[PDB]
Design a binder for this molecule. Structure first.
Ligand code: HEM
Ligand code: HEM
Ligand code: HEM
Ligand SMILES: [Fe+3]
Ligand SMILES: [Fe+3]
Ligand SMILES: [Fe+3]
Ligand SMILES: [Fe+3]
Ligand SMILES: [Fe+3]
Ligand SMILES: [Fe+3]
Ligand SMILES: [Fe+3]
Lengths: 157, 157, 158, 158, 158, 158, 157
């Protein structure tokens, strides 16, 4: 069924966002494990699959509203060089992503597209959940220090 | 059955004490886990539920003696800002709490209310048990140091 | 995640509201048992634990918004002595809570803090189903007598 | 091991008041049951059995102490003539023994017979459990009418 | 159902002699055990419990008959001072009650109270089982020396 | 938890008392087996391990009171050579212990150190049940002969 | 059966040695766990029970040779104040103990009491096993350092 011409645009921008978040944590998963931190790299992995199901949902919904999901392009990817940079790249991502999901959110009701609104309500809560978790790591880290952090976050033969 | 007008007062003061200890470790459970120390925050949690069953018992006993359990007010809550302050706030609490349970204890026999006395005997042993455990943490801590302590006490993705 | 300073005072209020509720539900639990009404007593035990999870959910979130929770105080408790007074009493508490919850949800909707909004909206349903329930006991009290209602909810001497 | 002369008879008045308890309780069981009130009849029965166990512990302790248990005569029993009277009559038997037990509990403190001392401190808590129970059964009875309580404690096809 | 006045007291002397039995037996259990003779102490205990059951049946029957059980006082008990004396003293308690039971068993025949009649004809066979038992334990004792019998009935690490 | 310096010397004494007991019980274990009395031997093995837990419970607590335990020494051991001398011997040790335990509990009651008090009170029951037991073997020795008692507790050549 | 009057003396001296080793590691088990190092305190415990079965064997054997096991006295107990002192007190013990079991060993054959010799062969191998393990700890320790050591060796709520 024909859907708000703008809700779709918003849903595409969103999709460009998760798809970015996907390649970015996936790429982080593989850097952290190769650095010796396979336990945060196990998380970085599940966070990527989580974003995977996010885009899946978004594409589902667009096609519903008779739109065309632009998968073709990503936004600018951030890649840390150090554990801490990895947790910032994610934090700064989840923040941008957020600001957007609300502004898109605040639009779906105006056009009275409510299920598409509570798919932003879902995402917002997810992201914020993800924000919660990132913050704690960076508190944890800059409390016990960046090496213990890594030890705590690695594994031995 | 009508009970010593004072044993009741004592039992209420006690109740005001556990109920304080409940909100204080519960609140600590949620601060420590958000700081990255979910493993001491798992203990802080069970210690709170332990105090939960304590108040439950106290209320049971008052109502027995035909008294009126004042749940309405708590004492002054202590909240650490740092792992160590968290383990002191608890220690100083368990100490006060103790001094009291004995003085109340020493009163139940005089008025010859013995089961109410051996409910202070229970609590005293509990608290002291809890004192035992706190002390060890603060020895452990100020031996291997405050960061290892936290690492030992946290968890990774 | 630096939260809106006004959102936090609303959640802090809901906290003091729920903590209050924990206590007043838990007291009626213990009075009812001792009076005899095993059953309704067992139900108030559980509705207290209900709140126990809500008080917690509030602390969780407040802390995440960078706020500082306040368990240091609670509101005026309504403790009945008859059985109907227990039900009247709980009702009034729920109504109060819901009036607060509806208001806090609107503040959040207006700061565009949506997850707090969905907490208060999931909070409202909670209290409202509670309400539905209580209004049924009192509904049933009117019908079968303020006395057969006690026996229904009384456990036998097992 | 030779006990304090007086401890070895506090034990024997506890034995006395326990055997009467046993008889009394068991009579009510058999009464409350012929009357129609099976459930409370059954509680009445469990409680006889718990005194059976007290009696035993007392007999045991005495013999360890080199004293001679006196199961010969038992106190005057109170037998109810209605359901309401049964609980009453059982509440006084209890109030007595609890009073007895304390007075003995501290004789033991004085002669330094701390395990006897503990026995009694334990026996108190069990007679207290029973009182809290009988009281509460009176509150309930009192409030849901002494006629419905009657029926809450019956059976039909059992 | 209103019983024959006399049947409703034969039942009550059987009740009497049964409760004494119970006490007596149980005392020997606790004695025979502090002495070292655990096994016979344990038989002594099972048998207390079987009288517990007789007492009950008697109490039941009386109440059906509209009579008032009299658990108030019990017969003079015979307490042994040696293992040999315990069995002796238990053998007379038995010879008595068996004698009592028959005399009552045919009162019942005469008033036509055939189920009471049967009760007693049953109680006989159970006191007979016990006699045959105590006798036989005397034969044995008598023959393998009253010192070995002692030990055949003991335990070591139990 | 800075403990009363006098409480600690009492627990230190109980420690030396129990450590002593461990050893003397464990020696009778090994002598009895070698003499033949498998059973009573197996029992002394276990009563030694009993103490093993008490010696431990003392160390635990002392350390918690901020004290310094002393395992460096023990008291004069009583080692019998006959089987009755083993039983006599253990008795005397228990009596000694209990006299110490009763005294230490009173010191604690008076410093208002209640958990140490409840340790010594739970310690007294321990030794007293032990006593009960030993006085039964010797009780049974008097009865069946100082010789059949050995055979009872002897294991056969399996 | 009557046994070498000296093998017995040696076996008693030995017994005085294990019994010393028993109270010493048991006492160490309880100090280390109260300091926050319950995982080395779990070992210190099993090492004590191991020595328990050692004395048990020794007493068995003496009584066999128609001797009288002197349980009455212990040697001078060592008690560390710090994890490291705990691992030295044990090391110095196991060393003394050793020197002795050989000298006793070297005597059982001369008097041609061979099973009593291969009970010293057992003990020697045990002790040396125990020596092996202590050494490794003190290498491990004075390599990663005394705090990591303790962290590695403790546990959290
Ligand atoms: C009068 C005060 C309270 C009493 C008497 C009480 C009592 C209890 C009891 C008895 C249980 C578990 C039953 C069992 O398994 O044995 C329980 C569970 C629980 N309590 Fe409370 N409680 C009190 C207040 C609180 C507070 C202030 C909180 C925190 C806001 C809280 C949070 C919880 C939670 C979350 C559980 C379930 C376990 C879980 O899901 O984590 N309670 N309580
Ligand atoms: C002399 C004092 C008495 C003592 C020490 C005593 C002891 C006991 C004990 C120990 C049990 C079961 C405990 C177990 O299973 O370990 C029991 C059950 C029973 N009691 Fe007694 N009793 C006494 C007197 C009585 C009396 C007066 C009655 C009333 C008729 C009675 C009737 C029964 C019956 C019928 C049972 C079997 C119930 C069952 O366990 O299924 N007893 N008693
Ligand atoms: C002659 C001296 C001792 C001997 C021969 C001895 C022997 C034994 C043996 C053989 C076992 C376990 C049986 C098995 O499962 O294989 C044991 C267990 C035990 N031992 Fe001893 N022991 C002695 C002294 C001590 C001391 C001084 C303590 C500490 C105070 C102690 C504390 C324990 C404890 C607590 C257990 C049971 C496990 C536990 O609950 O932690 N023992 N002993
Ligand atoms: Fe997302
Ligand atoms: Fe507590
Ligand atoms: Fe709620
Ligand atoms: Fe009782
Ligand atoms: Fe019979
Ligand atoms: Fe002991
Ligand atoms: Fe060794």
């Amino acid at each position: 069924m024909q859907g708000d011409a703008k809700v779709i645009e918003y849903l595409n921008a969103a999709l460009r966002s998760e798809l970015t978040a996907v390649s970015q944590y996936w790429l982080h998963y593989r850097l952290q494990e190769d650095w010796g931190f396979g336990s945060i790299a196990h998380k970085s992995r599940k966070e990527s699959i989580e974003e995977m199901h996010h885009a899946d949902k978004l594409i589902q919904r667009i096609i519903f509203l008779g739109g065309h999901p632009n998968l073709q392009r990503l936004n600018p990817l951030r890649i840390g060089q150090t554990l801490r940079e990895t947790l910032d790249a994610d934090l700064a991502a989840e923040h941008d992503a957020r600001t957007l999901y609300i502004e898109a959110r605040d639009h779906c009701e105006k056009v009275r597209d409510y299920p598409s609104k509570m798919l932003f309500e879902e995402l917002i809560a997810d992201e914020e959940g993800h924000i919660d978790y990132l913050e704690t790591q960076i508190d944890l880290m800059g409390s016990i220090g960046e090496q213990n952090y890594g030890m705590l976050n690695a594994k031995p033969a």
